[PDB]
Design a binder for this molecule. Structure first.
Ligand SMILES: C[C@H](c1ccccc1)[C@@H](CO)Nc1ncnc2[nH]ccc12
Length: 167
């Protein structure tokens, strides 16, 4: 039993809800919130910009130190950093950004990072401003993640389309 509320159950391990991931994190304080990161951990817009804003830029300050020490992530890769006021940990995961010409096949590799954590709050990787089809992202999620994932879909219209089209 966990404290996630109001989710529709899609499979044994995947749950979905129309929600603002910032507000969800602030309410649940999950062990792990997933950020839709880029390789530079520059949290400008979309989920990343919103999460970082909610931390009063502390996420960005921590991320800049991480990059200065370690260099950029790989597309499809991840790192674990602090969750600040939102969660115990933030798993920064880089899905491919179609608006940059990156290979959509890397979306499965990106979701594989979730399997290192028993329970996660997360957005659909590569969706939104990353330019992929969210219906495809949900399919890859369900077919790749084996741990318990609670997906927050900000756009209510998109949420209804994902539910109604889910196979
Ligand atoms: C599927 C979602 C989306 C939103 C709008 C237009 C199309 C798609 C997603 C895409 O990355 N973005 C978010 N999801 C959850 N919580 C969020 N908080 C701030 C952003 C955000």
């Amino acid at each position: 039993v966990n404290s996630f509320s109001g989710y529709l159950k899609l499979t044994d391990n995947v749950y979905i809800k129309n929600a603002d991931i910032v507000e969800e994190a602030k309410k649940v304080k999950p062990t792990v919130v997933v950020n839709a990161a880029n390789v530079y951990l520059k949290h400008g817009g979309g989920v990343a910009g919103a999460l970082n804003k909610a931390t009063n830029n502390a996420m960005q300050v921590e991320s800049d130190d991480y990059i200065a020490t370690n260099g950029p992530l790989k597309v499809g890769g991840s790192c674990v950093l602090s969750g600040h006021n939102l969660a115990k940990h933030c798993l920064h995961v880089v899905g491919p950004n179609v608006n940059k010409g990156e290979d959509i096949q890397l979306l499965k590799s990106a979701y594989e990072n979730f399997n290192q954590h028993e329970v996660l709050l997360a957005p659909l990787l590569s969706a939104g401003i990353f330019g992929a089809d969210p219906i495809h992202s949900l399919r890859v999620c369900v077919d790749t993640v084996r741990t318990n994932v609670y997906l927050a879909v900000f756009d209510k219209n998109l949420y209804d389309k994902l539910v109604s089209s889910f196979l």
